[PDB]
Amino acid sequence: AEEFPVPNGFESAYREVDGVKLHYVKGGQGPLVMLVHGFGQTWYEWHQLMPELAKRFTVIAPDLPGLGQSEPPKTGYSGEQVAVYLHKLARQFSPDRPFDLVAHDIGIWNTYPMVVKNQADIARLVYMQAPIPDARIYRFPAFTAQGESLVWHFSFFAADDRLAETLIAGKERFFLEHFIKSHASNTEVFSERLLDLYARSYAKPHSLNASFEYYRALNESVRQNAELAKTRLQMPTMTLAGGGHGGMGTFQLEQMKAYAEDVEGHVLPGCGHWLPEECAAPMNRLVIDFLSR
């Protein structure tokens, strides 16, 4: 039983990595591109980009540990720990060539450490819509003159007593719908069917918990990255951010400038956080052209 419909020409599969059974969807031929989803979602957020990319690349899109159909990590949820699973997964399919990496939201947190520690293995990098965990995250405001702020959820999700699981259980669809729309400029793309699919997936008790464990490990990730960041990224990099409600705006590129020597960035006016869904065509085009260089 697949939680989400698989694109024609792709296969849903599993690989054990360090004793953890990871789910992924894979298709295409050529050099490998790994696409890593973020909070609230699964591999399925890439389902529109995948077939287009699969024309020139082997494409793989894993479920993060504990989310979608992937087992929880056996080590833990910090960036460095999760990054190991993702790196070894990619290397199973691209042992002899560097691969490309595209990530969204916490997908960034869970890939950065392996990128910086295995630079020769990464051909090109695309990061979208979330800060790399560092001191900058401590500057975002708790509240704004227009209402709720962008990242107050860091504190809600990091809170102990299983605060988030406990408040959200039984109200999973309701919460996710509000979270998506509060970080979207274009809410229309999210049909009740699509909301249904995402809600049922992260509503799995172990997945609901996994969702927040990534946040409970966020400060540890930050401390991890304070060390890792003494080494700059040397591969070609692109950042993408929404310019509308829910978007990171100029922040995404400006932060990346501190990490990467070779980087370009785009802000998409009229788009929020959920780039692959809110602004699929232009996001798809920028990514494809960047990787096809």
Interacting span for a second copy (CB under 8 A) from 14-22, 56-64, 217-225, 241-249: 217-225
Report the distance separating Cα 37 and Cα 105, nearest Å: 7
Q: Nearest Cα to 40, choosing from 179, 240, 137?
A: 179
Cα dist. 178→47, 62, 191, 203, 280 in Å? 22, 25, 13, 15, 21
- Choose which of 1, 120, 145, 281 interacts with a second copy (CB under 8 A): 145
At position 103, the amino acid (one-letter code) is A
- Choose which of 16, 148, 264, 289 interacts with a second copy (CB under 8 A): 148
- Choose which of 56, 140, 187, 266 interacts with a second copy (CB under 8 A): 140
Tell me how far, at minimum, the Cβ of 173 lies from a second copy, in Å. 11
Site for a second copy in 218-257 (CB under 8 A): 218-219, 222
Give the tokens for residue 279.
Answer: 């602004």
Cβ proximity to a second copy: between 21 and 178 the closer is: 178
Cβ proximity to a second copy: between 169 and 258 the closer is: 169
Give the tokens for residue 283.
Answer: 């996001």
Report the distance separating Cα 130 and Cα 41, nearest Å: 14
Site for a second copy in 165-204 (CB under 8 A): 166-168, 171, 174-175, 178, 182
Report the distance separating Cα 258 and Cα 232, nearest Å: 8
- Choose which of 24, 46, 109, 154 interacts with a second copy (CB under 8 A): 154
Question: CB neighbours (10 Å) of residue 76?
Answer: 14
Tell me how far, at minimum, the Cβ of 282 lies from a second copy, in Å. 28
Tell me how far, at minimum, the Cβ of 136 lies from a second copy, in Å. 11
Q: Nearest Cα to 202, choosing from 154, 253, 168?
A: 168
Point out which residues bind a second copy (CB under 8 A). 135, 137-152, 154-156, 158-161, 163, 166-168, 171, 174-175, 178, 182, 218-219, 222
